[PDB]
Design a protein around this ligand. Sequence first.
Ligand code: BOG
Ligand code: BOG
Ligand code: BOG
Ligand code: BOG
Ligand code: BOG
Ligand code: BOG
Ligand code: HG
Ligand code: HG
Ligand code: HG
Ligand code: HG
Ligand code: HG
Ligand code: HG
Ligand code: HG
Ligand code: HG
Ligand code: HG
Ligand code: HG
Ligand code: HG
Ligand code: HG
Ligand code: HG
Ligand code: HG
Ligand code: HG
Ligand code: HG
Lengths: 252, 251, 249, 252
Amino acid sequence: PAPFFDLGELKLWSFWRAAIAEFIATLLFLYITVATVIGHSKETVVCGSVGLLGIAWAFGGMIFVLVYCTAGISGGHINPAVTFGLFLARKVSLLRALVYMIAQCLGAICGVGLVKAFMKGPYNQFGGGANSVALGYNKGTALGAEIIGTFVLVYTVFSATDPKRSARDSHVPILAPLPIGFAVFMVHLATIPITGTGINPARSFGAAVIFNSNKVWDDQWIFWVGPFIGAAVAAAYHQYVLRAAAIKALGS
Amino acid sequence: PAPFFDLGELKLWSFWRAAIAEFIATLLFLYITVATVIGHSKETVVCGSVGLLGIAWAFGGMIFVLVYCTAGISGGHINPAVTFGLFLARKVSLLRALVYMIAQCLGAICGVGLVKAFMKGPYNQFGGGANSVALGYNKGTALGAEIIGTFVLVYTVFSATDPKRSARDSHVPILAPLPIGFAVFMVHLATIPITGTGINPARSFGAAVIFNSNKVWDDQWIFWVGPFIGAAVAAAYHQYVLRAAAIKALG
Amino acid sequence: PAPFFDLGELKLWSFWRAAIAEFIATLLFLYITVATVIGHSKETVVCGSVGLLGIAWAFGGMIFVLVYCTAGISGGHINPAVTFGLFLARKVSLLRALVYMIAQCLGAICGVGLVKAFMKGPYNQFGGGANSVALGYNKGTALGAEIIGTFVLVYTVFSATDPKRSARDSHVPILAPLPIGFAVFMVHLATIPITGTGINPARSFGAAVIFNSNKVWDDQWIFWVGPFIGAAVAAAYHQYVLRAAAIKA
Amino acid sequence: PAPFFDLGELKLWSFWRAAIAEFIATLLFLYITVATVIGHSKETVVCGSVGLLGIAWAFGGMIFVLVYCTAGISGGHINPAVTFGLFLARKVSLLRALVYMIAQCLGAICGVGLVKAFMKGPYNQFGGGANSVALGYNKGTALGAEIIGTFVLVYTVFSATDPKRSARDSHVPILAPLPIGFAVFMVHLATIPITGTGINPARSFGAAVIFNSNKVWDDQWIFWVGPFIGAAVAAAYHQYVLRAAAIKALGS
Ligand SMILES: CCCCCCCCO[C@@H]1O[C@H](CO)[C@@H](O)[C@H](O)[C@H]1O
Ligand SMILES: CCCCCCCCO[C@@H]1O[C@H](CO)[C@@H](O)[C@H](O)[C@H]1O
Ligand SMILES: CCCCCCCCO[C@@H]1O[C@H](CO)[C@@H](O)[C@H](O)[C@H]1O
Ligand SMILES: CCCCCCCCO[C@@H]1O[C@H](CO)[C@@H](O)[C@H](O)[C@H]1O
Ligand SMILES: CCCCCCCCO[C@@H]1O[C@H](CO)[C@@H](O)[C@H](O)[C@H]1O
Ligand SMILES: CCCCCCCCO[C@@H]1O[C@H](CO)[C@@H](O)[C@H](O)[C@H]1O
Ligand SMILES: [Hg+2]
Ligand SMILES: [Hg+2]
Ligand SMILES: [Hg+2]
Ligand SMILES: [Hg+2]
Ligand SMILES: [Hg+2]
Ligand SMILES: [Hg+2]
Ligand SMILES: [Hg+2]
Ligand SMILES: [Hg+2]
Ligand SMILES: [Hg+2]
Ligand SMILES: [Hg+2]
Ligand SMILES: [Hg+2]
Ligand SMILES: [Hg+2]
Ligand SMILES: [Hg+2]
Ligand SMILES: [Hg+2]
Ligand SMILES: [Hg+2]
Ligand SMILES: [Hg+2]
């Protein structure tokens, strides 16, 4: 029976800085990625943007950069679904988890907020970076895609945990950033045409909050439930089926 | 004569988990990559997809990710031709090889099956992620391109083996993931116009089973014979010509 | 209060070689990237160029390559804003900072000059690799984008410092090149549509000097002020808020 | 002062295998990259190929892969200009250099030969992967682009040399492969519009020999002379100006 918090949460100066790092990181994540999306969507020259490929790179490349910078401070989650998966495997206390998830959402809101402020017209005209079910797919397909996508991501996160090194003043495992960055990249390549790719409830929520349309709000549940389920299946797979929690993957 | 199995295969709990890791990995491989292919093919706006470059990245990048995740558990093969090459070099017993190959084929079938379940009309309309000889090329060319493409891959795999570290409870060498993923990305840049790029019999077999068309079944043998030959040539070249089995590469 | 220089700047042989490395690397940075940009802009076959994605790669990949080559010699800055940020965190002395910034600017001018010499017509006709505010955006937006873009870069730079290893005969920290190259790549994907992406006053200045147009000079201050502000905030955030100078990523 | 050969060249089993590794690697380099070029050029559907970006990746990524595989056997040169630069810096003997340059040239010819054998029609119709001076540039510009191009590559090679580890039975330094591959990738982004990008006399020679057109042969001297000069200048810069031969670069 896992306690609500532990002594690492009483190291308040570090715990506060971990929270800030998650907040600022998720802000930057959303700023760079949604600005990339809007910059793409608004372009009038045919084949004169960074393209869907550029967009998939923005999301994957930013998770690489942000986990690189924050792994030693917070554990580098940038993603309620990642925090949720790790909480389920008891690598993160409930109190740390909820503090991280709030930070991530508020940061996502602020980041999309910044994109709207910089490019209000194109932002509103071209869908505000929001996830929703694309034409021709049903909600069940959307949800399945969000589950398997988040699974790929959360399973990569588990395999990328360092069993010996932890974020400052915590037991939160350090994460190897490149493979997690690449997993995000891969999932976007597959999933952009179906939902835009969520796999990150905060990323989806921030976009929904700022864009604020009925259609986007109606689909929003898929981007919470899908990722949380995917994360849960990844935690069970890694912990229970493969028994791989002590394994250190050799990065490349 | 190499024995059928060794004491590592009597470590039943680990060996079962290695098979599962190969099953799940190959399922995820086919799912991400075939969904990317179908997603590209169905897009109605010109230059509005991830393009053939995005497709090549999906195959090379997923191999990087999956070998990264599974090297420590199974050895990270995700590919009967890789398993076969290592079997010929005696790094894998016959029993482990067959179990890995079966696991990989079944995984592939399941991953493509999942793409079809998600997008049935576009899945069948745009060719099902299947390999075949493209218009304008002959069988000999397709076969040669699969041999050499598999050679580049399997030579890289051999170069990437860690001579001191093995998968859990085994002597299956750990593999450096990024050069292998890049090798796959590279071969796809070259071979997509010829065959769609096989270099992986389970990848080609999973798509042939789910798509189930005469043309795809007709060409299927190329995607077994080509990679198996390329793998044997790479094994022979690494082991006998260069004698580089103890060599530890860094990247 | 910081001293103008320290004993490391009296190792003249090394200090001069560090300046040359920053000079040559920034030259190479501008040549490869602006040649890519002009090469893309002049192509006549629609979809026949490396695309805006290729251009974003040229900027990010060159920083990866150049920092890799020079981190052990100069500290691998290639960028007055990176140098400024490090100077503010007192990782570099005022004298080394100025010598680096001057070397960077002159390197950038020489690299852009070389592109022009190789392809004068296309260079002039397609904008000279210069940064300026793109149509439909205002000065505030361009400035904001440059602040936050440079913040991403310089924050990654600080996370990428090695706390135990330094450039030859100095205390300038070695930098891990790939995260920094990737941060440059990422910022381009977002910012190319807004300003072309500056996040580097020497890269912006090199192009302005060689292209020499009214609009480009008029906007030039943004590409000094924006990155210098972004760098200062990244330095304050890393050192004062996160207190992370001892950490190795 | 440098002797023609040293005792490492008397270790014949290893020297032979190093020559073979260079031969086979250069063959693979030319096959993958030229097949990529021809596959791109023949595409009938607009924006339906890997594009110029994909071609640049084929060249840069194959150098990464091949230097990864061969560094521990031959030193991973794959390129007479690289071998030449290292020779000038006395890192490779004259005998080893010439054996390597011949192996590379023979390898390149075979690699391109394989592409033509597989797809003769489109190979011949779309220019055979040959380098030559593009419309609107003069010989001086192409020469200069090749010099600086090869300078970027060879200076990166020198920076990537491991000062303590060498190829099997030799003193030829091991090379860190990813920066060298990325250098190749960067030079292609800039130089494809000017010459196709040579920066490698074997790669240029192999394509000229197999494509075999009068115009291409006319330009071929640029692709020997430009790279050899760039390599020489890179060697002088690294060795004499920066005195960097003992520095170990930490790769990322
Ligand atoms: C393990 C599963 C292997 C399945 C092999 C499928 C082979 C299908 O092969 C095809 O069979 C058809 C008759 O059904 C014929 O139309 C074709 O001649 C033949 O190519
Ligand atoms: C592990 C399972 C291996 C299955 C290999 C599939 C081989 C399919 O091979 C197919 O066989 C057909 C019928 O003989 C031939 O007509 C086709 O030309 C051939 O491609
Ligand atoms: C080497 C130090 C570089 C200093 C950067 C030069 C900043 C250019 O600033 C420019 O000044 C012009 C003339 O005053 C103004 O008209 C322009 O608006 C402004 O962009
Ligand atoms: C190992 C195979 C080497 C082939 C010889 C290439 C030597 C370069 O010689 C070339 O020969 C061509 C033949 O018509 C002439 O047109 C060119 O002018 C000449 O440069
Ligand atoms: C055997 C490999 C080294 C030889 C390098 C081949 C360079 C060919 O060089 C070519 O020679 C022709 C005739 O000699 C000239 O007319 C061309 O201008 C020149 O490009
Ligand atoms: C286009 C993709 C090229 C990226 C390959 C770079 C090799 C990664 O090398 C290292 O891997 C570590 C493990 O995650 C990271 O912490 C480091 O940032 C990275 O430098
Ligand atoms: Hg939240
Ligand atoms: Hg907020
Ligand atoms: Hg905001
Ligand atoms: Hg994974
Ligand atoms: Hg099988
Ligand atoms: Hg199955
Ligand atoms: Hg399934
Ligand atoms: Hg290889
Ligand atoms: Hg300056
Ligand atoms: Hg200059
Ligand atoms: Hg110049
Ligand atoms: Hg960062
Ligand atoms: Hg030669
Ligand atoms: Hg040959
Ligand atoms: Hg041949
Ligand atoms: Hg370099």
